[PDB]
Structures are given as structure tokens and as C-alpha cells.
Amino acid sequence: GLPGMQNLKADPEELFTKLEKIGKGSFGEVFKGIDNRTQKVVAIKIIDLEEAEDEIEDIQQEITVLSQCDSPYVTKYYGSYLKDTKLWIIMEYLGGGSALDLLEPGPLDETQIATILREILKGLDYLHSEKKIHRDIKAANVLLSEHGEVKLADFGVAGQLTDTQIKRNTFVGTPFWMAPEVIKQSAYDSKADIWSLGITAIELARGEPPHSELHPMKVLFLIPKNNPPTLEGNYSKPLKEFVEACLNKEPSFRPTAKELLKHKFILRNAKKTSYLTELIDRYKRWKAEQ
Ligand SMILES: N#Cc1cccc(-c2c[nH]c3ncnc(N4CCOCC4)c23)c1
Ligand SMILES: [Mn+2]
């Protein structure tokens, strides 16, 4: 039973005008689309189910997790449609670019980094309160609306905790951002997302996560072996400390998302999300001169 799945008589090729490919998600490509009834722009992920086996279970879970989320900090889910062998997953469209794209014209300043991290933390606090774990936190999965609103996307590997299953052990995520306990498949919880947040903070400050120049297989031994990464360069002490707070090998030593919302780096530097339009405009202009 796939949540939000619509009637098979509903033809998504009739209900939506599929436009250009905007990227990829887990299991399929993502396209920009227009909802023909409201004229609102949507993001559509298309999965060829015939081109899949033992992935439908992971596909169902992504949809279930998305459907149970109701937050200004998480991409909205508008239902699923089956067209022959292809599943159309309709999601909220965010036109501002990902935090990673916004890094292309040049570095971010600490106000921008703090603002983005604060909104990610709002999303993480929501998910964690709902006993959900995102598991793929990185700048490419942090999307902005054209107004500067920041939301979490890519629920392809998200997990659910229950009163019976208080911890997860599955190997999921993107190597460079994965927590040591996830890579070693130890019992883990929401603290794994706090480690990925620390890596994301380095990425927002430097433009790339640690070990970015290495093969992802090398990081599978390096992350559990090495001391946790630190933020190197001329960055503020509160920013380096924020990074260090997230990047502790001991998960119980990592603060919760709610606690990090009161970190001095956030409180001293974060500003209204509306200021992020300057970053969106900077990217639009840059793109136009490439
Ligand atoms: N499954 C999933 C998935 C993963 C990551 C992001 C999104 C996504 C939702 N709304 C969007 N609006 C604008 N760009 C978006 N992305 C598409 C992926 O490439 C980058 C640009 C999205 C969906
Ligand atoms: Mn992805």
C-alpha cells in the first residue's frame, strides 16, 4: 500500500506538463513540471519499476516517510501516479537552487552559513521529534525556495524509529557525510544526522566536505579510523566550535538539533531567511554568464 497513490485512470501526462530534467534522486530522475489544474510548478521524480527489483521496498518507504511529514522545513509530497511501468512522485518545487549550487559563484559568508544551518536544524528538530532520521544530509539536499526558505529534500534513505526499534543499523547515505557508527553498521539513531550536519557545515564553509579528493572506498576506512574532521582556515571560533560539537566520534557527545539551535554560532550570526535571496540572485546572474 503506497501512500498518496492516486487512481490509475488519472493520467499524470494529462494532469502535469513534464518539463526539463532538473536532476536525480534515489531510484530515478527529477523533472520540473507544471500542475495543469493550478498552474503551480512541481518537481516530479519518475521511476521505471520494470527497471527495478528489491528497490520497490525502498521506494515505498521514501513515499511513506514523505507522506508522514508536515513541516515548512521538509519538501511537501503531493501524491504518486502510475503510468504504465513508470511511477510519478509529485513533490514541492523549490526554485532557489540547492545550497551546493549557491556555493558555485564563490564562498558563503558566516551570516549565510549560520542562516542555512539554522533552517537545516529546524528541519532536523522536526524529523527527530517525529522519530525519523534523514540519513542523507548534505548541501545538495538542502533546497531553497525563490524567497529564501530552506527545506530538506531527498528522503531516499530516511529511516523510522519505533518504541520497539529504538535504533537502526542499515548502511545508507553518501560516503563523505556518513557518521562513523553508520559506516560500521553499529546501532544508531538521530545523532547520525548531527554528524552529517557537521560535515555539511564544513561543506558550506569550504565548498566541499573533508576527503572530497579521495575515492569513496578510502573514506570507508578513514572515517572510523581518523580523529573527526575539523574546520581549517580563517573561520570564526564559534563556527569551528559548532563543527567540533557535531563531529564527535561518540554520538551521545553530539548535541541534539534543538540544542544546536541555541549554539552561539547560530545566535550570533543567523539572520532572516529573506536575506538569502541575495545568494539566489548571485547564482542566477553567475549562471547567466557561464
Ligand atoms: N527524490 C528526490 C529529490 C532529491 C533532491 C531534490 C529534490 C527536489 C524536490 N523539489 C525540487 N525542486 C527543485 N530542485 C530539486 N532538485 C531535484 C534533484 O536535483 C537537484 C534539484 C528538487 C527531489
Ligand atoms: Mn541524492
Describe this structure as you would to a colleague.
By secondary structure, the chain is of the alpha+beta class. It has helices spanning 12-15, 56-68, 110-129, 180-183, 191-206, 216-225, 237-246, 257-260, 264-269, 277-288; strands spanning 16-25, 28-35, 41-48, 77-83, 86-92, 97-98, 132-133, 142-144, 150-152, 159-160. The protein has a 5-stranded antiparallel beta sheet with strand order 1-2-3-5-4. It is globular. Residues 22-25, 30, 43, 45, 75, 91-94, 98, 141, 143, 153-154, 156 line the site of ligand 3FE. The PDB classes it as transferase/transferase inhibitor. Keywords: MST3, pyrrolopyrimidine, inhibitor, kinase, TRANSFERASE-TRANSFERASE INHIBITOR complex. The assembly is monomeric. The entry is titled "Crystal structure of MST3 with a pyrrolopyrimidine inhibitor (PF-06447475)".
Task: Provide a concise account of the structure shown.
Helices cover 34% and strands 18% of the residues. By secondary structure, it is of the alpha+beta class.
